[PDB]
Amino acid sequence: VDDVTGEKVREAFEQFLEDFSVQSTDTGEVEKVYRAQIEFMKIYDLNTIYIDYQHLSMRENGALAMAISEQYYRFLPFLQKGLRRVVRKYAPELLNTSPEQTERVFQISFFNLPTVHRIRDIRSEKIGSLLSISGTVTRTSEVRPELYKASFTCDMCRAIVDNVEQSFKYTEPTFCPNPSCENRAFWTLNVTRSRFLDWQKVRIQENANEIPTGSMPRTLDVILRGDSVERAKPGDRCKFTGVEIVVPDV
Amino acid sequence: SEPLRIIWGTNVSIQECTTNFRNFLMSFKYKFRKILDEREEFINNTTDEELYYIKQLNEMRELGTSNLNLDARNLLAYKQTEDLYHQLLNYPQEVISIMDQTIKDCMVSLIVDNNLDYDLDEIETKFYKVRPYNVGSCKGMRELNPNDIDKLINLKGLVLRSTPVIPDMKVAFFKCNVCDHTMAVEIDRGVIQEPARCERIDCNEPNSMSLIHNRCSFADKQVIKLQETPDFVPDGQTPHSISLCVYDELVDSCRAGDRIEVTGTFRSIPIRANSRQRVLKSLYKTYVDVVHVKKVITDQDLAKIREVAAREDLYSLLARSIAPSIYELEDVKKGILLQLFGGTNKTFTKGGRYRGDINILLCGDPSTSKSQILQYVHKITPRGVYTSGKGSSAVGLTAYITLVLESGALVLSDGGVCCIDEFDKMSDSTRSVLHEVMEQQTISIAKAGIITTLNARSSILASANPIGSRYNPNLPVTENIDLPPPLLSRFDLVYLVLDKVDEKNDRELAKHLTNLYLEDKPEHISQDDVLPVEFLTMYISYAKEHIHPIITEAAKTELVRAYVGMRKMTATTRQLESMIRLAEAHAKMKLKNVVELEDVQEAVRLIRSAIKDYATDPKTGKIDMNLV
Amino acid sequence: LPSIQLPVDYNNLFNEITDFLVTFKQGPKYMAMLQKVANRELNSVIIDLDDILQYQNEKFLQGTQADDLVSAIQQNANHFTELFCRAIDNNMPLPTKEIDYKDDVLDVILNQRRLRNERMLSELFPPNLTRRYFLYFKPLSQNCAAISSKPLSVRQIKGDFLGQLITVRGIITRVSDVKPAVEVIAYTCDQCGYEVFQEVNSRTFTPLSECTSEECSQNQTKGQLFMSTRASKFSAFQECKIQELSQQVPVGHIPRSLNIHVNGT
Amino acid sequence: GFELSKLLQKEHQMRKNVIKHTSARHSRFGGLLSIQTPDKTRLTVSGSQALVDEKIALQKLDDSKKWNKRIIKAAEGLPNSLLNSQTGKAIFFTESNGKHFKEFINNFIDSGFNILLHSVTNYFTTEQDRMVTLEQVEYLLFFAWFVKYQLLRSKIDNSADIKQVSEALKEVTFILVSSLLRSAYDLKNWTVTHAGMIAFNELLNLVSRTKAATDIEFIVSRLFSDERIQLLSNLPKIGSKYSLQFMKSCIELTHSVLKVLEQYSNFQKVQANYMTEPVIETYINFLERFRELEDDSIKKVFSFFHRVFVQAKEQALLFRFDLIILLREMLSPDGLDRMSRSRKYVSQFSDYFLARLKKRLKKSPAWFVGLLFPPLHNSEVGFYQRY
DNA sequence: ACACACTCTCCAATTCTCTAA
DNA sequence: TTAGAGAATTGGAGAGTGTGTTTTTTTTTTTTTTT
Numbered sequence A: 001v002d003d004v005t006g007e008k009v010r011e012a013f014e015q016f017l018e019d020f021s022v023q024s025t026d027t028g029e030v031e032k033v034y035r036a037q038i039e040f041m042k043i044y045d046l047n048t049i050y051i052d053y054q055h056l057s058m059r060e061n062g063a064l065a066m067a068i069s070e071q072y073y074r075f076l077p078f079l080q081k082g083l084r085r086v087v088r089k090y091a092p093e094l095l096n097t098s099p100e101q102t103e104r105v106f107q108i109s110f111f112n113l114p115t116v117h118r119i120r121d122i123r124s125e126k127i128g129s130l131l132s133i134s135g136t137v138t139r140t141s142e143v144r145p146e147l148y149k150a151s152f153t154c155d156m157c158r159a160i161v162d163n164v165e166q167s168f169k170y171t172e173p174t175f176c177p178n179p180s181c182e183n184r185a186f187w188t189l190n191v192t193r194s195r196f197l198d199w200q201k202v203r204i205q206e207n208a209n210e211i212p213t214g215s216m217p218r219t220l221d222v223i224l225r226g227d228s229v230e231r232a233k234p235g236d237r238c239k240f241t242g243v244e245i246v247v248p249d250v
Numbered sequence B: 001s002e003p004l005r006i007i008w009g010t011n012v013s014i015q016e017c018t019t020n021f022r023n024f025l026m027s028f029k030y031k032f033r034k035i036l037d038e039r040e041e042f043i044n045n046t047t048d049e050e051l052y053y054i055k056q057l058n059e060m061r062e063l064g065t066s067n068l069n070l071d072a073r074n075l076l077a078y079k080q081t082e083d084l085y086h087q088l089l090n091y092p093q094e095v096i097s098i099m100d101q102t103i104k105d106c107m108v109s110l111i112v113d114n115n116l117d118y119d120l121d122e123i124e125t126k127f128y129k130v131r132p133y134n135v136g137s138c139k140g141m142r143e144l145n146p147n148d149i150d151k152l153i154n155l156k157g158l159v160l161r162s163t164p165v166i167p168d169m170k171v172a173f174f175k176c177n178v179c180d181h182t183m184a185v186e187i188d189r190g191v192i193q194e195p196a197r198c199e200r201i202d203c204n205e206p207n208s209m210s211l212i213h214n215r216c217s218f219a220d221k222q223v224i225k226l227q228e229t230p231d232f233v234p235d236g237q238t239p240h241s242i243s244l245c246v247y248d249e250l251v252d253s254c255r256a257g258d259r260i261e262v263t264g265t266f267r268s269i270p271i272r273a274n275s276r277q278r279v280l281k282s283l284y285k286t287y288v289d290v291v292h293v294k295k296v297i298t299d300q301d302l303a304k305i306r307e308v309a310a311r312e313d314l315y316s317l318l319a320r321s322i323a324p325s326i327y328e329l330e331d332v333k334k335g336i337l338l339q340l341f342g343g344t345n346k347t348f349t350k351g352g353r354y355r356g357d358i359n360i361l362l363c364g365d366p367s368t369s370k371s372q373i374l375q376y377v378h379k380i381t382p383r384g385v386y387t388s389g390k391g392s393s394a395v396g397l398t399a400y401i402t403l404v405l406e407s408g409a410l411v412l413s414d415g416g417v418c419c420i421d422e423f424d425k426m427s428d429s430t431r432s433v434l435h436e437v438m439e440q441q442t443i444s445i446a447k448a449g450i451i452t453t454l455n456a457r458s459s460i461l462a463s464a465n466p467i468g469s470r471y472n473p474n475l476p477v478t479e480n481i482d483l484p485p486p487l488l489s490r491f492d493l494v495y496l497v498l499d500k501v502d503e504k505n506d507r508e509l510a511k512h513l514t515n516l517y518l519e520d521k522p523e524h525i526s527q528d529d530v531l532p533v534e535f536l537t538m539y540i541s542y543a544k545e546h547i548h549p550i551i552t553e554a555a556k557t558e559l560v561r562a563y564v565g566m567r568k569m570t571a572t573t574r575q576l577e578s579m580i581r582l583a584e585a586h587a588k589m590k591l592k593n594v595v596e597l598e599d600v601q602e603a604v605r606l607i608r609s610a611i612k613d614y615a616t617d618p619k620t621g622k623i624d625m626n627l628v
Numbered sequence C: 001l002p003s004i005q006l007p008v009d010y011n012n013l014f015n016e017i018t019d020f021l022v023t024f025k026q027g028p029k030y031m032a033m034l035q036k037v038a039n040r041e042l043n044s045v046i047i048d049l050d051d052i053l054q055y056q057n058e059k060f061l062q063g064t065q066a067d068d069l070v071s072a073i074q075q076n077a078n079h080f081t082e083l084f085c086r087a088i089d090n091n092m093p094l095p096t097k098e099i100d101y102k103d104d105v106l107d108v109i110l111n112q113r114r115l116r117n118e119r120m121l122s123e124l125f126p127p128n129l130t131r132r133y134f135l136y137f138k139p140l141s142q143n144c145a146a147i148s149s150k151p152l153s154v155r156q157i158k159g160d161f162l163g164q165l166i167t168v169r170g171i172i173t174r175v176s177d178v179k180p181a182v183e184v185i186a187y188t189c190d191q192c193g194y195e196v197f198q199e200v201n202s203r204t205f206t207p208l209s210e211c212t213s214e215e216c217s218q219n220q221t222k223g224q225l226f227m228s229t230r231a232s233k234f235s236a237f238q239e240c241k242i243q244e245l246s247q248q249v250p251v252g253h254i255p256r257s258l259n260i261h262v263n264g265t
Numbered sequence D: 001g002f003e004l005s006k007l008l009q010k011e012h013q014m015r016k017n018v019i020k021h022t023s024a025r026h027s028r029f030g031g032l033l034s035i036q037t038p039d040k041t042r043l044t045v046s047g048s049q050a051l052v053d054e055k056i057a058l059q060k061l062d063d064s065k066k067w068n069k070r071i072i073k074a075a076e077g078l079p080n081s082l083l084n085s086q087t088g089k090a091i092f093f094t095e096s097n098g099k100h101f102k103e104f105i106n107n108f109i110d111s112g113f114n115i116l117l118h119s120v121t122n123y124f125t126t127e128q129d130r131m132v133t134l135e136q137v138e139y140l141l142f143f144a145w146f147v148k149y150q151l152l153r154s155k156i157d158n159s160a161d162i163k164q165v166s167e168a169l170k171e172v173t174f175i176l177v178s179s180l181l182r183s184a185y186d187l188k189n190w191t192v193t194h195a196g197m198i199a200f201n202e203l204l205n206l207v208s209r210t211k212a213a214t215d216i217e218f219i220v221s222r223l224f225s226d227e228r229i230q231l232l233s234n235l236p237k238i239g240s241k242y243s244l245q246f247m248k249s250c251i252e253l254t255h256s257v258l259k260v261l262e263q264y265s266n267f268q269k270v271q272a273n274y275m276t277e278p279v280i281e282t283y284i285n286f287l288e289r290f291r292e293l294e295d296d297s298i299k300k301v302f303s304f305f306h307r308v309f310v311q312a313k314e315q316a317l318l319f320r321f322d323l324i325i326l327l328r329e330m331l332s333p334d335g336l337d338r339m340s341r342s343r344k345y346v347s348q349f350s351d352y353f354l355a356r357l358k359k360r361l362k363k364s365p366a367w368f369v370g371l372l373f374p375p376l377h378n379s380e381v382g383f384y385q386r387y
Numbered sequence E: 001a002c003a004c005a006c007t008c009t010c011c012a013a014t015t016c017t018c019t020a021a
Numbered sequence F: 001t002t003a004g005a006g007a008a009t010t011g012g013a014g015a016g017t018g019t020g021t022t023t024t025t026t027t028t029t030t031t032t033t034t035t
């Protein structure tokens, strides 16, 4: 089964990346800033791209921006698939990170959203949407490696399983792929073939000047990944953006 | 004839309830409630004939809002719903749902019948809820019994604390692992009804679906801790508390220290012995499931307020009415009134913010009725606290580390009046806390694991007796009061009250106090003309909200002249600011937008009158008792 | 596995109980109370042992032998709460006044269940589910007197007394607030539309999860059971603690205490 | 972006459908409901919406029951193609790639199609006995694709012409496609039977095009000798067991076949050959999976039902209960969209259906028990039963 | 020993196929 | 064209086996001995 909305969003975001076509800061000449940003990333071997929400708002009567805003969690993989094709088209050197080279894990980023919420305004109706939040940092954790994609090999026979997906808990295969063997136990994680990500926990509290009458400040936990770890500092004031999620009891 | 729907174990038919509530909703008019009221003479024929709830529904449509209040007594007025009232109390869960679906259908019927422009899809999308209240007599917290389970209840109490919002699941989302088929599933009775096999026809496989957490749908839940009010506690015991569960709209309504009345079903549930197995314990937990919360405007109100403000004797009328039964002490009452009104809050783009609140100290001989006045101030104010000197610690007065921070008295009293009695008994260590809060109206904390600043817009009303426990005329006034200068400097008004013997005064006082015992529950009152407490509260609240005076050039000249006169001779910089703040408070009480020469002179006069300056020897600082 | 003889036969004592409830007078005393119970006016019955002693003496003076029921219910007090309840249920008179019977959910449920059985045919439920009253014993007057009349301090309550009816003197230390406790639990089967009950005595229990009804089974209807509060039976519960007087503590010792349970009115 | 926005409107409609079955108050607030039948027997259901909606209560009551009857299942040995995959799923092109591919196959058709098909078809007539399944399925799905594409292109624009694909009609290729379908059907090789079905469908469509403009009528008369009518009438009956694509191929072929013989003016003999129970069984079995199907196939199905019910006046076939369930499912707010063109046809059919059913049931009350079961084939009572 | 998770085994319910009237 | 006799495939009833469980601050109110 296939989701038509995802593919249409994918290949519309493709067109946005191709031909946003804003004119120059100084002259009436089409500049195509995001293709230039891809070229910049190619020059410096970067792995993240920044997008302005105002630019997305004016595109195609705002429907694409609405779809990205209200259902970010559904549509994030399709945006990645859309960006991969464009970077292949114009800068195939960026797709790889001598022996073979693994693929680059691109990151899309947004900024200049319409409004900033407080920690006190987080409510369960907004789960999975795109938001921005501000507060004071109070604690930070050390950087840890998070397992992103896994690969295992069977003990009782020479067989390999690859590209297992994790989500919130450490997860392992269900069968031995070789039908000559039935052992489910004694898997081992191949650290070389598997892939990891950088991961950091930080903790924030409300701004002091905003606290209502007779109340006390609430707190929140925030996750940082990729090239943004160790950017925050305790005691500083910061502004965040992302999506709020829900974490189980593992 | 046909199958029927019956509430389980009742033989109550849902059709009758639906039709009766529809008729009530679409034909009730307020006149019937006045028939049940004491007199038909109250009836306003023009207004009371109107269809009340149709008006409410039109307002709900055009304001884009979802919830309807309903005081249950109207069900008794309309003849067709007399029995529905009892059924509501006995079977809340089914009846309230019936009422909800009735209201939504009526809202649709209005637009389609009256053929209006409003989007039908929008109304179909929304949820509509009824919220009954004023159900009946309130019930003591300790007197709820097991025969009250699942019936509607009404409680009064005070709010201790509230937990943060908890996400509560309502809809589950499944996805097929192999073929990527998806299904949404309804949650009822707390159990997820997972499918046995993937429902796609060609992918009919077992164990093939799986849950996706962050694509589910959730709802807000919160738990509030309610404490028994002292009026009901048994003799020689301490108050108890009960827990309230609240959802969706009413989540973040209430803060610590609030005083409320609620309405909700009284529920009970089991609890497990261990998390591994289905073994339950014999004792059941109990809690309350609230559906409405209440705190314990019209042109006629504005007309009454404006008409009262035009009276010549307004200033004396308001002052003598805050504490009717207390004899004389007029200046003390006037100062307390000006504390109640308060100044104006000023904030700059740079250079800070300046307090509007007034601090008062009452000092003098015993038996002079200071604490009785503190009782009146404690009960008049919307928010506030009463406490004693020996009952207060430094932590309890401000804030408490428990890792979480917790509020003290001055924080709970934010925006109100904090009454402190036996002020002279608390130690210098405890009293040193009040410097920062009085000056800045903020509380700074720096302890292990917590460092922050909190706001405290709190007014202090203090009571004390002099050193030696009776005023000694052979010592100067500052030595009798005995508070250190850094703390005494922070009060706007300081009162001396003295137990001076005089036959003229004594006969009037004795006749006043003895008259209260001529009746079992006295009707007698000190003065012919006083305002009721409700209307006085309305006046003060409106004047606080709407009026914001500003200084005038004539007022500038008088303030400079008066401050220089008192200073040139001890008066300090704080005397000027307190004078401005008192003049602002005086201006609000007359509903003026400008502070004027009269207000400044009144503020000066009251400051001079409070500390008995006219009777004070200007050089030695002692008071001639003969001049009192 | 083994067995013994004992001097007591409960049939004779049951006969004595049912005679005592219908005969004794200071009409008979307790039939008035049971009439008030039937009228829904009264919630509890308090049995005096002074009445039983007087009854025994009067029966003896009439020239007939009788078992000493007083000592019998002091020695093994727990069993006789059930015997008296069964006797009361057997002998309960009919109401004197209209009641508005439809206010009771259990009446409607049991009437419908009986009608279902009647149609099907073209113990049912535990008797505890319909006992609208409580029952207590009151000890012997000491001035007529037996151990139940003589107070004991908390130290004198040895392990010999387990099972007996006694009296204790002391100071209360703490009291809990009231909460409900289950006695009979009610369920509903979704597919076959049939109700079943469960009785709870121990501190914990396992709820039912399968409809084992014979009709439901023979239709092979593996339906699901769900709990219901609206037809369950609760009873009020409270727990306290009592402690010996300080002026009775022997030298060098620490005071002792006992746990008290309270149910009903 | 425009079509994406329209699709988001459709998503909102589905969201609205979920909302209309969603309770206002939370999941543990719910009370309990009891429903009493005739004969005073009572049932129990939970949930707040059951209190008000009897339809939802009746559906929810049956939904709890555990059992489902286990189910029966046709092709293997060939990579993925139209024969064994749902082809409502495109593959996606760049603008340059789209125009380049269009240019390639357009030049192919205008240049190469006739010469290639003549050579390869006059090969296989001399080599049919030696064939393997690959070459049969290859030939039959090359034929179909290019004929269909030329028909659509000339439907669109006048610059194209139908003469570019005209080699398909000449007699040898017609004989060969016929022979492949024949031999595949006899040996019960169902994959080649499917592919031959698709090819023979396109030949009939092309004939109906050319008659709308000499030898083509001769080719028709030879295409509809009685033997071929026996085969083409036999085909939908066996389709009941097979995958969804097989039944759809049968339906579209049947539509084309009957329409061509409609425009021949024999007809009454041929139509009576088609109308009987097992064909109607296939049609209903196909129709109940409407959630996966196109807008057009349902139009074809209800065209056939109009033919059976109104024109031929063989009303007795459709008085069978599993059709009456389907019209409830398809016509409810559950299924077909309130504004799709399907609802016009469906409601206009159901009105007449229930009118005639009312008449029949009041004239003869025995049909109440009749509606559950198949019709009864006894000589003496069956004739009055059917009419 | 008392609820659970998981494995193993046998038996009969069901559909498919062939034969003759 | 119906139907009935024989063979093959599948479901889950239910019986069996193994398993797990009890159980150095830092902040704040109060009594006590020590300078």
Ligand SMILES: Nc1ncnc2c1ncn2[C@@H]1O[C@H](COP(=O)(O)OP(=O)(O)NP(=O)(O)O)[C@@H](O)[C@H]1O
Pocket (backbone or CB within 6 Å): B325, B326, B327, B328, B365, B366, B367, B368, B369, B370, B371, B372, B373, B464, B465
């Ligand atoms: N002017 C007065 N009007 C009314 N009651 C008065 C007045 N003067 C004294 N009383 C009575 O005298 C008592 C004074 O009690 P109280 O309120 O404690 O005075 P106080 O100022 O608090 N003295 P103290 O607590 O020793 O510092 C009360 O019973 C009053 O009713």
Ligand SMILES: [Mg+2]
Pocket (backbone or CB within 6 Å): B370, B371, B372
């Ligand atoms: Mg006092």
Ligand SMILES: [Zn+2]
Pocket (backbone or CB within 6 Å): A154, A155, A156, A157, A158, A159, A176, A177, A178, A181, A182, A183
């Ligand atoms: Zn293996």
Ligand SMILES: [Zn+2]
Pocket (backbone or CB within 6 Å): B176, B177, B178, B179, B180, B181, B198, B199, B200, B203, B204, B208
């Ligand atoms: Zn699937």
Ligand SMILES: [Zn+2]
Pocket (backbone or CB within 6 Å): C189, C190, C191, C192, C193, C194, C211, C213, C216, C221, C223
């Ligand atoms: Zn059952």
